[PDB]
């Protein structure tokens, strides 16, 4: 239903090993569709999705110019934040920047983000109204400069009016990829821990999008209190994985059932082994 | 290649009605979204206005209610009506097309 377009920018400051490394990755939903690495072979924004390879060369020139502007501004940002926090030049520091827009079912603007972090902790971010900033102790001066430059309003213009339109263009271009919902493929794995206890695992393989719920039920209530669960792991082919395992007291497996909830499931599956 | 033949600036009197202009040539897909900026001498660049292909308008709080961003798809032109120019508005303006990542050449606006 809801879609989202995000850009993640990472600048890490090599104190004595060249100019800072810059990585910029764009995501629509869970699919990464563009990339840029300042240490890569080509200083060009490279496509990472098939449906965007058909964008015109002028599009790629624009993306490359804007990502180089981001890289230069992030270099100056590292230089400025080191001075703001009175840190020594020899230290290596990282700057992370994320912005993007969300879109509802009826394909309208739904939410707009622009967050900024220094050394992995929050520095400054745009509030949900796209008109004000949330700032840290030494990020107050950055907020003041950003309000003087009226960057909040340009950010609102980008997120609400052109981020949404570009997200819709990407959705229409990737109709067979982004708008798909790969249903989970599921297994139950039985392994023996001892003669009096065994582990029962509920697999969920190759599903898209990444959101999913695995709940174990003892012929009744949920069993999240003694369940082993892993994070949705990226399969690598564009889909995702997850499993959830409990311990059966060696013979009461039929009492245990895993419930997998997903958008691609017409009725949530209920495996029993 | 693309180029922004922005013009229309100059010296205006306080409370004037200056009307900036900006057009693109060489690339026939720039009309997707275009915005205006400015940079007073000695000051950092500042957002002014932006307009999308459908005509949605966005302004900074300083220029809200007195400036006007306008576009016409047929002639590729984008304009900026500038009613009531306070003397704070003396700056070199920059028309930028968002699709191409390209900045204008800096039409100058000075107000007495």
């Amino acid at each position: 239903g809801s879609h989202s377009m995000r850009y993640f920018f990472t600048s890490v400051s090599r104190p004595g090993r060249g100019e800072p490394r810059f990585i910029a990755v764009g995501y629509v939903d869970d699919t990464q569709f563009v990339r840029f690495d300042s240490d890569a072979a080509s200083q060009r924004m490279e496509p990472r999705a098939p449906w965007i390879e058909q964008e015109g060369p002028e599009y790629w020139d624009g993306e490359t110019r804007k990502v180089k502007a981001h890289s230069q501004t992030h270099r100056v940002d590292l230089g400025t934040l080191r001075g703001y926090y009175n840190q020594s030049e020899a230290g290596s520091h990282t700057v992370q920047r994320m912005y993007g827009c969300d879109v509802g079912s009826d394909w309208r603007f739904l939410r707009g983000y622009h967050q900024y972090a220094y050394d992995g902790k929050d520095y400054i971010a745009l509030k949900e109204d796209l008109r004000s900033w949330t700032a840290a102790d030494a990020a107050q001066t950055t907020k003041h400069k950003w309000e003087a430059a009226h960057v909040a309003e340009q950010l609102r213009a980008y997120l609400e009016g052109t981020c949404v339109e570009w997200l819709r263009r990407y959705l229409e271009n990737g109709k067979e990829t982004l708008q798909r919902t790969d249903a989970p493929k599921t297994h139950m794995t039985h392994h023996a821990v001892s003669d009096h206890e065994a582990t029962l695992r509920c697999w969920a393989l190759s599903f898209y999008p990444a959101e999913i719920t695995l709940t174990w039920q003892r012929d009744g209530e949920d069993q999240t209190q003694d369940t082993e669960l892993v994070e949705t792991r990226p399969a690598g082919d564009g889909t995702f994985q997850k499993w959830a395992a409990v311990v059966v007291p060696s013979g009461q497996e039929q009492r245990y059932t895993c419930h997998v909830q997903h958008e691609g499931l017409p009725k949530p599956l209920t495996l029993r082994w | 290649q693309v180029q922004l033949q922005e013009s229309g600036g100059g010296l205006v009197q306080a409370g004037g009605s200056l009307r900036l202009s900006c057009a693109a040539s060489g690339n026939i897909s720039a009309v997707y979204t275009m915005g205006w900026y400015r940079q007073a001498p000695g000051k950092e660049r500042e957002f002014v206005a932006a307009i999308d292909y459908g005509g949605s308008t966005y302004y900074a709080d300083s220029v809200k209610g007195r400036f006007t961003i306008s576009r016409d798809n047929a002639k590729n032109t984008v304009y900026l009506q500038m009613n009531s120019l306070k003397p704070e508005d003396t700056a070199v303006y920059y028309c930028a097309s968002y699709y191409h990542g390209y900045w204008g050449q800096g039409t100058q606006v000075t107000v007495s």
Partner: peptide, 9 residues
């Protein structure tokens, strides 16, 4: 696409 003009901190 990306943001056009992003400001320095």
């Amino acid at each position: 696409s990306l943001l056009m003009w992003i400001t320095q901190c």
